[PDB]
Design a protein around this ligand. Structure first.
Ligand SMILES: CN[C@H]1[C@H]2O[C@@](C[C@H](N)C(=O)O)(C(=O)O)C[C@H]2OC[C@H]1O
Length: 255
């Protein structure tokens, strides 16, 4: 029997969650969600077995000032995982050090905030300071602002970087709690926003998509699996299964 593939991933609802059960759950059975369903479908098309591991440091992957990567990106670089199957955003900087399949889901950065305010866009956030705003620290969303050369986004980065102790948050759930408990707007991927707004009728996406990208399966550079995974994703798309999986996890279940 050929080798079990090691898959790195990260807890992020709905994509990867701990399954709830009365019975004890072991190994891969402990996890459920969109990415686990995807991984199952991929393994069925491509004929591999796998072992799901969380990224040890609990991070997506960013570069430090020395250029060193961490998170799921580093696990792939260092060949401690064969695949990353997660809501891992395909970015030019990451493409330099790891390979990605074609996307299995598209998204754009946008804004999560409450309904019923005069805030209609990023520009409306940028031109004021009363409403705090920010992003999950050290992910592709935060990095977008850090690296932007667009006036509005530079101003927003200046704001959230100078006010970093309160404006930048640890993870999605912490950001959502800030939106819920304080006057705060979270810069967040549209996929996640949709999940939230389906579950809290006081919350809304503000404005449109600030960028346009995708999540892809990551592999170490040069992996022969990357193209096979692309082909499998294309098949799932052709079969309508990617649409089915999104519907399943975003609007029923639940919740
Ligand atoms: C999967 N989406 C969520 C998560 O995506 C991240 C990580 C990003 N998907 C990445 O691959 O670095 C982001 O930066 O938007 C961190 C966290 O932020 C809130 C929301 O966008």
């Amino acid at each position: 029997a050929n080798r079990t593939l090691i898959v790195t991933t990260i807890l992020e609802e709905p994509y990867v969650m701990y399954r709830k059960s009365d019975k004890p759950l072991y190994g891969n059975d402990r996890f459920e969600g969109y990415c686990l369903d995807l991984l199952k479908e991929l393994s069925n098309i491509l004929g591999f077995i796998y072992d799901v591991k969380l990224v040890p440091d609990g991070k997506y992957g960013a570069q430090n000032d020395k250029g060193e990567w961490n998170g799921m990106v580093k696990e792939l670089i260092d060949h401690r995982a064969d695949l990353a199957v997660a809501p891992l955003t395909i970015t030019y900087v990451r493409e330099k050090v790891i390979d990605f399949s074609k996307p299995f889901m598209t998204l754009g950065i946008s804004i999560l905030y409450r309904k019923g305010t005069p805030i209609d866009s990023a520009d409306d956030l940028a031109k004021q300071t009363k409403i705090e705003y920010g992003a999950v620290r050290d992910g592709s969303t935060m990095t977008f602002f850090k690296k932007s050369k667009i006036s509005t986004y530079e101003k927003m980065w200046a704001f959230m970087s100078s006010r970093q102790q309160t404006a930048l948050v640890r993870n999605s759930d912490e950001g959502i709690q800030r939106v819920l408990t304080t006057d705060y707007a979270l810069l967040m991927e549209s996929t996640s926003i949709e999940y939230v707004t389906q579950r809290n009728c006081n919350l809304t996406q503000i404005g449109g998509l600030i960028d346009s990208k995708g999540y892809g399966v990551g592999t170490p550079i040069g992996s022969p699996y990357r193209d096979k995974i692309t082909i499998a994703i294309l098949q799932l798309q052709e079969e309508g299964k990617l649409h089915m999986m999104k519907e399943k996890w975003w609007r029923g279940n639940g919740c």
